[PDB]
Amino acid sequence: MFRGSLIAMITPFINGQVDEKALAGLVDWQIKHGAHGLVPVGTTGESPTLTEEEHKRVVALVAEQAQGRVPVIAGAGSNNPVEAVRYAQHAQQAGADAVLCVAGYYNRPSQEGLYQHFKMVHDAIDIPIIVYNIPPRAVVDIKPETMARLAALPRIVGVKDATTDLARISRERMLINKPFSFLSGDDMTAIAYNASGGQGCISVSANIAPALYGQMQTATLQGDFREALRIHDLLAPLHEALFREPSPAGAKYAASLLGLCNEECRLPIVPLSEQTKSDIKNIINELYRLEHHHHHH
Amino acid sequence: MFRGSLIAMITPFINGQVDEKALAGLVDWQIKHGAHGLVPVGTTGESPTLTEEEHKRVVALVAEQAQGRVPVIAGAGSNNPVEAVRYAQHAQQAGADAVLCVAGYYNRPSQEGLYQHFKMVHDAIDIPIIVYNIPPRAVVDIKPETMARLAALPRIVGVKDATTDLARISRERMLINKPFSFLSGDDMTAIAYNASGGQGCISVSANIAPALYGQMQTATLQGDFREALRIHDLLAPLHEALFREPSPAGAKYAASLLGLCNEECRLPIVPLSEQTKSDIKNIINELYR
């Protein structure tokens, strides 16, 4: 249902507020340069530090600006399913095509608790859900048997797998007996994931290099792993630099270098070191040098 | 203070809302039966599933009913320091003695980001802060050098250490040169922690056995570690059973057996299995008889 390069969108700020002009421009620029889909207001979009009003406004503005050109999968994460229901219902009303749902961070519930959280969101809306499995941030882990129970629900349609355990997709595929949108939640292993049955990635780096990242994803989907790895290798220095300090500090700074938005993030995300800024700048300049050298029409 | 048996209070519910009557009764009962302090709307009080209004209401009701009889340390946790500031400012207005602050869960910031979060809360209020270090739930870990930097601020006055790493207190004590309220965040190792320089515990089990838990804590503070271990040995089965399934399901059920509140918690906390319920019932029967 949802395939390829799906961008975990940054949220631009100006004078302490959502930068609506920059956000609209970002949607247009990302679509122009090869986004296969957009995922506003996940943690890369600073969902934890947006107000409930800002969260909904960003989703609404992205859905409006996309104009149906690519799918929009709205973040509806919370550790409280009552809150997640509110985000998901709004997303549906604002014209999002699906929602992305993490559960259980900090309160650390059982598998049954995770299941009931997701069932609550599922039963409250009419659009599809991608469940978000990210033990490295949430501690809790949606286990394969739980994933299979979730897959029995008609509108749980995929997973953003940020476990970094590449055996996990195999364990899930052994238990899930319907088509399922397996999506990587880790840029560094996106190729490994698609070779293992994945069909895309909800990506941070695609904010910055949407054209290359789209080409890489399409190559994996067309079975051309030689071409995909070639592009992955080009992007590896960028990946390292974008994640060296806690994301989205890196992506926000990189986007500022491209003239897309201000570099600012909200606490507890902090400004980059001068060394990290320098490394990002040099990497971006090199990618542009290479593109200009190789381009011809 | 802050010292001894500090109760990580459960939040009672009734028909989907905060049970204000049970909450007032719980404050009275816990104080009557030996609480050294009360810590409303932490993790155990289901801070994640309370609305902002409910969080503030629970803090206000607990401070009101406590009537200054014991210290009240209000939860002011969030992964957004803007929100944490709102809880902490309300807590001060409501008469809390201090706030307990976790930071950085899920967004997973750097040491500098954690520092800036706590500094923002610190600068917005006049009451002190106990920082809450709980990597097993938050992933982020306030490292010893960061704790020392925090301790340089006048109103960062202690830590709830839920790392479960009993070497950590030693590493922090090596770097902190002012009096500091080192508090355990783990009931099972409360004695170990105080023997290593700790001066209390923000405790889940104390909801249910406040008298015995208070006696245990006081024994450690008076240097009678033989007596402390004797009581620990009585409480260890309770500790295990209250954490067998994800807390606070266990504490809420246990309190319901004591007639203190309804057993219900909010999703994603779920009802206990019949086995866990039975084991808790047996433990309560043994303790209160």
Added chain:
Amino acid sequence: MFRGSLIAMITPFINGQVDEKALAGLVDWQIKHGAHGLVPVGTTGESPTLTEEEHKRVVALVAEQAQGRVPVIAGAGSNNPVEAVRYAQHAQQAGADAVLCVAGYYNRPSQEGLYQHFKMVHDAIDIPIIVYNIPPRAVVDIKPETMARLAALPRIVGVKDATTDLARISRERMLINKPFSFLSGDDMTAIAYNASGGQGCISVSANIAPALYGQMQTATLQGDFREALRIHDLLAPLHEALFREPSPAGAKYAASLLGLCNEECRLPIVPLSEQTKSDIKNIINELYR
């Protein structure tokens, strides 16, 4: 130098002694049914419980019986480099083509200690080395910068990567600038590894299904990851059953069902449960055929 499906050979026993008859038969059968190389006396071959002399005699037999038909990479693991040198020197004299070397388990040395271990083995022999990186068993982890230092040595020619960290190969590849045999040490992620730049796997499950595993590896080297994944899906139940209890108990039992050897392993590897045996038997029947 090494590509495709390489088998981490089991070592068969009878009355607890090495069954040389079964071992020679296993070499012939595995080569007949599609092995690309043989890797005797790793942990799958129970290196930890073979005496030094048994280890050497097993390597010699496999090298001789292989008769140059496929490469033989002899295990020369130890946490003592002096012992590893003895294994590697014997392997060379016995006609092994290369050695597979783990280091640092239990004693848990630094990166420099690991480097010096491998350099000692390297400098003592004339045949090449595959470095074995397996933090899940050894705790120590050869970091990418250390791997690059190792690759600078002329006869370090590849790695068996059992980190299960699929980002690791990218990090090593960026730093290594000569032909280098990147080999998976994890059956479940073998396809992922090859998609990421790997060129084969030193496999446990290939002991039992060498023909299908050979076909899966071939597909990845052809660039047909769709066919590779279809084969992986056929082998999925087998992988799970072979690793349900601590390996090599599973592989040894499966090989016994094929008539190749007894199921016996040496303590602390223990007999399988009847459920695991039943599941493996069913899987073998489904595959064969």
Added chain:
Amino acid sequence: MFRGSLIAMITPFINGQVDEKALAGLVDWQIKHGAHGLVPVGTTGESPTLTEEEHKRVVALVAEQAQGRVPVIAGAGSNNPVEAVRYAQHAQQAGADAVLCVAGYYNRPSQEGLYQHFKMVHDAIDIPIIVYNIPPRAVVDIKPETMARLAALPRIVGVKDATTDLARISRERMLINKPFSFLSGDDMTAIAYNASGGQGCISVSANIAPALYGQMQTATLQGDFREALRIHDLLAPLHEALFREPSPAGAKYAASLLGLCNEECRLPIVPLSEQTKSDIKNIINELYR
């Protein structure tokens, strides 16, 4: 029945050999200066890089030189129980009072495999066994129910708990009813462990500060935890410096500063950095006047 400060002895080397003269002198010096027991040829004694001949000779020499003044608990660790049996049998014939046994590193057996390993050693000797639980090095973890199963054997008499999980002793004490020597395997948390029911520590730091370490242990055993913590605070910098780089590099160098032996260890243990040497030198100077 084993209590207090039990030294995880370093093994001194000279010209690539066991330094017998230094070893005898070390036994005498450590006993003179307050050792409550001696534990030769564990990993601090570089058991992984000693030959079988050296392992046995070091045990024999330490038992001989101790002359029954303090208990001698010989290392008989291996991931192969057949090898462990040989070490333990020799230890007994050499006059050791007990053996210390780790199992299962690298091969990573099941709980049943660990049990069978220990049972095999148990049944082969007449002297008692202290089980060595060290997941940080061995990965395998002897779980509380397995420890209880081991405790049902008559000559399994204690544990060296190097889990660094201070809840573990509580979980074990909840299951074990017979007299049992609970011993810490972690210097930094030795006080915490004894406050939780432990009765000693098999200690690395006690190699270097036996007098202070013995005083600290005795203080815990007498219930004087204030005194124990005072001494712990004096020793904490030493604990940190001795484990900064992979042990026993730190302990061997510190002992060399005291004139007890040469600083050398065997690969993969490597020489200390100048910074670490300087820090150890400053700590030694501070302690010894």
